[PDB]
C-alpha cells in the first residue's frame, strides 16, 4: 500500500502471498486509509478466518471506476481493464492520493483502456496496444476512418472533483479449496494465568484445569504430553516454550 507504484490501472500488477499472517487491524482499517470494502464476507469474519493463499492486485483508478470493482460489474474498467465474475469473493482497499499524487496540470501518467474489441475474461489481463475497431474495420498499426486508440489518460488535477481523483485501489482474492491453512489474520491474542482453574487453549487442545510449572523434560519436537490412559498431563507454552 505504501509503495503506491500502480499508477496505471491498465496492465495492473499481480502478487501471490502464502505462509504468512494478514493482520487486518493495521491494513485497510487505520486512520490513513479512506475506504475499504469486501464481498461475500464481513471484515471480522475474514480476520477470524484462515485462507490457503491470497492473490493481490493493485491499480489506481478514478472515482467513477471504483464502483466497477465488484462481482458482476460492468463498465470501461470492468469490461476492458479488470473484469470480475459474479461469484468473486474478496476485498478492495481504496485510498485517495490526490493530495500527494496529483499535480496542478499533470497526472497524465494514469492511463486506462477506454475501448477494446471484446470484454476481458474474469481475472484476465491484457497488455496489447492494438487499435480499437471504432466503427470501421480495425487498423493494422495505421490511421483510418476512425481507428481510435483504446487507451486514454485520466489527467488528474485539482480542477477535477473527488469523483475524478487518483484512488489507489488494491484488490485481494482468497482461496479456500484444498486448504492446509497457511494464511491467517489473528493477532497475538494471548493471556496467561496459573494456580487456578481456568479454560485454556494451546493451539487447540481445549480443556479445563489448573496450570502449574512442571519438572518434566520435554523433547524439542514434543508439544504436549499424555499420562497413563491418554490423559493430557503437561503442555508446552507456544510463546515462552
Amino acid at each position, epitope marked *: 500500500f505504501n*509503495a*503506491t*507504484r*500502480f*499508477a*496505471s490501472v491498465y*496492465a*495492473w*500488477n499481480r502478487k501471490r502471498i502464502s505462509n504468512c499472517v494478514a493482520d487486518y487491524s493495521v491494513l485497510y482499517n487505520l486512520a490513513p486509509f479512506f475506504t475499504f470494502k469486501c464481498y461475500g464476507v464481513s471484515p471480522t469474519k475474514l480476520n477470524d478466518l484462515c485462507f490457503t493463499n491470497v492473490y493481490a492486485d493493485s491499480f489506481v483508478i478514478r472515482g467513477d471506476e471504483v464502483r466497477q470493482i465488484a462481482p458482476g460489474q460492468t463498465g470501461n474498467i470492468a469490461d476492458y481493464n479488470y473484469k470480475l465474475p459474479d461469484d468473486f469473493t474478496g476485498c478492495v482497499i481504496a485510498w485517495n492520493s490526490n493530495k*500527494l499524487d496529483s*499535480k496542478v496540470s*499533470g497526472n*497524465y*501518467n494514469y*492511463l486506462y483502456r477506454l475501448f477494446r474489441k471484446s470484454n476481458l475474461k474474469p481475472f484476465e489481463r491484457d*497488455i496489447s*496496444t*492494438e*487499435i480499437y475497431q471504432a466503427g470501421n474495420k480495425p487498423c493494422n*498499426g*495505421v*490511421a483510418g476512418f476512425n481507428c481510435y*486508440f483504446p*487507451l486514454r489518460s485520466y489527467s488528474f488535477r485539482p480542477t477535477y472533483g473527488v469523483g475524478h481523483q487518483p484512488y489507489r485501489v488494491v484488490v485481494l482474492s482468497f482461496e479456500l479449496l484444498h486448504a492446509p491453512a497457511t494464511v491467517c489474520g489473528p493477532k497475538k491474542s494471548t493471556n496467561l494465568v496459573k494456580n487456578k482453574c481456568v479454560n485454556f487453549n494451546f493451539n487447540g487442545l481445549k480443556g479445563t484445569g489448573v496450570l502449574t510449572e512442571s519438572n518434566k523434560k520435554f523433547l524439542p519436537f514434543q508439544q504436549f504430553g499424555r499420562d497413563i490412559a491418554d490423559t493430557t498431563d503437561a503442555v508446552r507454552d507456544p510463546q515462552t516454550l
Partner: antibody
Amino acid sequence: QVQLVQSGAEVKKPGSSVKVSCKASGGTFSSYAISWVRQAPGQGLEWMGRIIPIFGTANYAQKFQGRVTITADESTSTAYMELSSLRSEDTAVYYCASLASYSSGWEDVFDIWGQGTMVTVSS
Amino acid sequence: DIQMTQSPSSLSASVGDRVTITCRASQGISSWLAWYQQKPGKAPKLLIYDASNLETGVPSRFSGSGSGTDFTFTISSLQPEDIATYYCQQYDNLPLTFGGGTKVEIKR
C-alpha cells in the same frame, strides 16, 4: 530486441528550419512512443517534446511550444521533428528516445536511445 | 517549476572507498525520482528510475533510498570504470528538471 537509427549531422543557416529523423525497428511499431531530447556541449539535457504515432496526438514543452513540431510515419517506421527560427545557441547534441513507459505497467520513463545527431547554427 | 539541489558538488575517494550523494526537491515527494550516470560527452546511462528500484543489468553495487523533500544515493565502492558524473531527476510532472550534477574521481 529494440533499436533506433538516427540520421547524420546537418548544418543549416540561422533563421530557417532543420529536419531530423529517427527510425525504429523491432517488434511492432505501434507499441513504441518516441520522445525527443537535446543535449548541449556541457549543459544538461533538454526535453523538446513527445509523440505517440499510434495515438495520432502529440505534446510539446511550454518553453518550446509552437516553434517545435513532431511528426512520425508508420509506413517506414521513422519519427521526425521540425524546428523553426533557429539560433546560434541551438547548436547541441540531439537524441531520439522511445517512451516505452506506456504499456507494461511502467510509466513516464525512457529505456531506449538513438545514435545522436549533431547540428550547428552559424553563418 | 520544480528546482532541485545536489550537494556536495564533487566527491573524492580512492578505489575501494565508500561514497554517497543526496538529492533534494522543492516539495516533499515519495516516488518518481531517478538517478543517472553520464560520462564526459556520452549519453546518460540509467541507474535508478523508481524509489529504490533498479532496472535490468544494474549491479548490486548501487542502491538508493529516501523520502520526503530529500533523497539519498550511495556507492559502496569505486573502480576506475565508473568515474563520471551523477545526476538527479524528478519526473512526477511533465516539466522535467535535472540536477546540477556531481562528480566522483579517484583519490591518490
